[PDB]
Amino acid sequence: HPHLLAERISRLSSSLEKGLYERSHAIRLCLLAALSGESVFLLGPPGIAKSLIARRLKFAFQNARAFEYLMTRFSTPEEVFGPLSERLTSGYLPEAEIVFLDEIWKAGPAILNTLLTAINERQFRNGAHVEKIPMRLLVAASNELPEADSSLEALYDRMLIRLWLDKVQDKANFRSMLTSQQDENDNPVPDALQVTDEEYERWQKEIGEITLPDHVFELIFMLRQQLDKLPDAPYVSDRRWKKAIRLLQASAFFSGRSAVAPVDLILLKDCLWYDAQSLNLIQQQIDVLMTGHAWQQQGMLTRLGAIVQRHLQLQQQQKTALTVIRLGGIFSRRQQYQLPVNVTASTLTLLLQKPLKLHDMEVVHISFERSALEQWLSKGGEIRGKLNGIGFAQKLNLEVDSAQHLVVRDVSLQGSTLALPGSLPGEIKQQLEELESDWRKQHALFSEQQKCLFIPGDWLGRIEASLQDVGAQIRQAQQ
Amino acid sequence: IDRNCHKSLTHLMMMSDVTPIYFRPTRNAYGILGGIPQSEFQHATIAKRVKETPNATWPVHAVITNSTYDGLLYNTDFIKKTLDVKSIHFDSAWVPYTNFSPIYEGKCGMSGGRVEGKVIYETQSTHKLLAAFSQASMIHVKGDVNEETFNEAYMMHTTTSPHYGIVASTETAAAMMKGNAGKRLINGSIERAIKFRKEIKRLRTESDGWFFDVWQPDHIDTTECWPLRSDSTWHGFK
Numbered sequence: 001h002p003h004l005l006a007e008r009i010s011r012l013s014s015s016l017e018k019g020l021y022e023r024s025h026a027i028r029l030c031l032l033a034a035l036s037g038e039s040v041f042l043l044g045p046p047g048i049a050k051s052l053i054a055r056r057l058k059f060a061f062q063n064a065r066a067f068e069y070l071m072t073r074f075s076t077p078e079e080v081f082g083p084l085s086e087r088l089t090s091g092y093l094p095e096a097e098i099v100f101l102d103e104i105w106k107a108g109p110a111i112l113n114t115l116l117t118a119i120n121e122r123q124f125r126n127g128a129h130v131e132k133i134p135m136r137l138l139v140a141a142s143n144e145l146p147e148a149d150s151s152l153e154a155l156y157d158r159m160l161i162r163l164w165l166d167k168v169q170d171k172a173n174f175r176s177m178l179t180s181q182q183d184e185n186d187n188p189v190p191d192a193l194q195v196t197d198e199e200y201e202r203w204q205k206e207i208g209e210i211t212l213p214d215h216v217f218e219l220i221f222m223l224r225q226q227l228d229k230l231p232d233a234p235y236v237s238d239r240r241w242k243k244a245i246r247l248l249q250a251s252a253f254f255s256g257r258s259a260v261a262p263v264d265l266i267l268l269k270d271c272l273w274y275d276a277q278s279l280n281l282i283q284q285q286i287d288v289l290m291t292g293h294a295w296q297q298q299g300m301l302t303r304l305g306a307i308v309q310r311h312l313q314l315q316q317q318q319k320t321a322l323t324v325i326r327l328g329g330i331f332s333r334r335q336q337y338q339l340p341v342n343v344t345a346s347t348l349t350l351l352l353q354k355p356l357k358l359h360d361m362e363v364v365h366i367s368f369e370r371s372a373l374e375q376w377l378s379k380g381g382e383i384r385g386k387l388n389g390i391g392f393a394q395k396l397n398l399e400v401d402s403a404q405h406l407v408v409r410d411v412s413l414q415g416s417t418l419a420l421p422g423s424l425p426g427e428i429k430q431q432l433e434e435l436e437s438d439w440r441k442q443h444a445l446f447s448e449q450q451k452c453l454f455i456p457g458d459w460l461g462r463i464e465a466s467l468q469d470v471g472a473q474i475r476q477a478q479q
Numbered sequence: 480i481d482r483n484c485h486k487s488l489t490h491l492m493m494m495s496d497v498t499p500i501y502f503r504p505t506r507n508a509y510g511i512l513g514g515i516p517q518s519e520f521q522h523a524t525i526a527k528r529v530k531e532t533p534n535a536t537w538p539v540h541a542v543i544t545n546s547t548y549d550g551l552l553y554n555t556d557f558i559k560k561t562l563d564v565k566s567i568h569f570d571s572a573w574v575p576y577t578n579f580s581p582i583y584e585g586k587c588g589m590s591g592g593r594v595e596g597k598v599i600y601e602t603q604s605t606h607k608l609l610a611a612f613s614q615a616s617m618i619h620v621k622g623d624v625n626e627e628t629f630n631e632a633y634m635m636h637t638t639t640s641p642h643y644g645i646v647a648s649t650e651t652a653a654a655m656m657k658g659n660a661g662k663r664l665i666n667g668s669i670e671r672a673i674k675f676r677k678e679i680k681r682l683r684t685e686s687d688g689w690f691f692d693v694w695q696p697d698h699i700d701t702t703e704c705w706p707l708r709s710d711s712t713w714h715g716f717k
């Protein structure tokens with residue numbers, strides 16, 4: 001049942017896009033805020049399809065009312081909500097569903113005070129008491145930006161989505177747009193794709209039931225701390241973070257998912273900035289976060305770089321000697337330490353060059369105990385080691401060498417430098433396949449949730465390029 | 480705690496279960512570390528690294544290396560007002576003389592008055608640039624501290640039989656500087672230092688070849704502390 005919901009939404013927005021080219025980000029975003037109870041703001045020059053999107057989304061319902069109003073410098077509240085006789089609000093805003101308000105940055109002080117109460121509580125005073133408003137989508141467009149210290153910032157800080165529209169730039173998409181025959185006043189939405197009033201009240205409750213994975217909280221909390229490190233970043237209060245959770249839960253709900261997906265963080269690019277200066281800062285930090293901490297992009301770079309450094313170090317170890325390192329600290333006797341990641345076994349064996357006659361017999365390999373080698377090289381004493389891997393741990397005359405080696409002395413005071421038996425090294429290939437397998441696991445999640453309708457198309461060229469860059473580099477060292 | 484800390488300050492963080500916050504002092508290319516910028520003392524900076532670093536509360540103590548190992552005094556007139564710390568420490572282990580000269584007013588923690596709600600901690604060395612036996616130090620107090628219970632912590636590192644030969648020489652350093660007969664040693668050391676600075680520039684141009692250079696401004700005619708401005712090239716601090 002949840003899988004069939006993503007197909008019905010994809011077909012609903014298909015007819016809405018027919019007639020407005022290069023405006024998929026301004027139409028698909030308004031559908032998410034209408035089915036979840038959010039708002040949206042537009043900005044740009046008058047004439048980039050800003051009022052038609054408010055009159056196009058009403059055809060996707062069955063009981064929607066349009067309201068295209070233009071705020072002026074001498075506008076009165078009695079001409080916006082309805083003149084009083086108690087207020088004749090027949091087809092305006094208190095009983096409408098989708099209202100449009102253009103040039104909102106020039107109304108009076110009484111109009112702004114009424115728009116703040118119709119968003120948080122969906123109520124509006126009517127002389128004495130208040131009443132509910134069945135508003136589903138709130139859209140507002142303009143052209144200029146408000147002041148830095150004014151009373152108009154109380155409404156801008158409450159809106160969620162801040163769309164950034166612009167004129168057309170592509171030449172291929174302008175040919176059919178210049179001579180379009182699609183009418184903007186008909187009903188291109190079929191009668192089978194329109195939702196009813198019963199399905200709307202049920203979807204408003206199932207949004208809050210979406211679980212919040214632990215991996216998603218690690219990216220949202222990190223993004224909040226990243227914005228605090230930049231003094232030029234816009235100030236975001238706790239009210240925006242509470243409404244941002246509903247935006248991500250509603251996006252994955254209509255995409256055939258039951259939990260919050262990490263790909264839903266792309267919609268946060270239009271919910272933090274406020275002007276043209278902060279526009280290039282919010283879209284920049286999210287692009288690094290999505291291509292650095294979302295699918296563990298940088299998490300694989302800190303491990304691949306260590307393999308390249310380790311591959312060059314093993315070139316002089318894989319003829320074969322054994323260099324003993326000195327452990328740190330202030331001690332009287334010059335203590336020695338074993339090898340770290342090179343050897344890990346407990347009863348490993350050690351070879352030798354010139355053979356000696358120990359205990360009146362020949363030997364070709366001597367094995368030492370890891371639990372006994374760490375104590376003799378630190379606390380001192382005498383070491384005990386068996387011969388040819390058999391017998392008991394007999395005592396030997398082992399000492400330290402000037403070139404950091406293991407010289408085994410016998411009854412004739414002869415030297416014998418010990419060494420470890422040798423085997424793209426095996427350690428490099430073992431550590432590389434584990435990192436390469438993690439890239440396929442992170443790419444498998446991205447090769448399933450990319451069909452989300454609420455994702456901009458221009459971001460697919462940057463997220464996929466970031467995953468292919470690591471894959472092209474991890475396959476070069478294995479050549 | 481300051482980033483440019485001494486070996487003694489490292490063992491302090493290893494014996495107390497605290498969460499220190501390290502700063503980022505300025506530096507050049509010759510290796511001479513500058514000082515902590517003024518942006519690290521504002522109110523938007525102290526609580527900035529507290530929430531980012533897990534397991535950290537409001538800082539109740541601040542250690543400032545003033546001066547550093549090379550000898551670079553800071554500006555205490557701006558730290559005592561901007562830095563909102565009720566326990567600001569000044570590591571004055573290299574300047575036991577910022578009082579007996581008028582070119583040091585308002586440059587150290589002892590110069591000025593009692594800051595309301597704060598206290599100045601200075602551990603000036605005694606057997607470094609004075610005249611006393613080894614194993615001697617002082618603890619300056621500018622405000623209100625502890626003494627009854629604090630004496631128990633002092634006895635944890637000091638034996639019950641102190642060596643009076645060091646104590647007699649420790650107070651002697653405070654008596655050798657009192658009066659005009661002691662103030663001539665501070666001003667006399669400055670006059671001999673400025674004279675040595677002028678002899679380097681005199682033997683540099685008149686010489687035929689390379690010669691040593693003193694890290695000093697182009698104008699050293701005055702007798703005071705040369706400030707590090709922003710329109711100079713001798714300090715090289717960006």
Ligand SMILES: Nc1ncnc2c1ncn2[C@@H]1O[C@H](COP(=O)(O)OP(=O)(O)O)[C@@H](O)[C@H]1O
Nearest residue numbers: 019020021046047048049050051052168177184
């Ligand atoms: N970028 C665009 N692509 C396609 N059609 C557009 C575009 N901009 C405007 N239009 C068309 O112009 C008509 C009027 O748009 P209008 O409401 O004046 O836009 P705005 O509200 O931004 O001034 C609409 O029916 C729309 O189809």
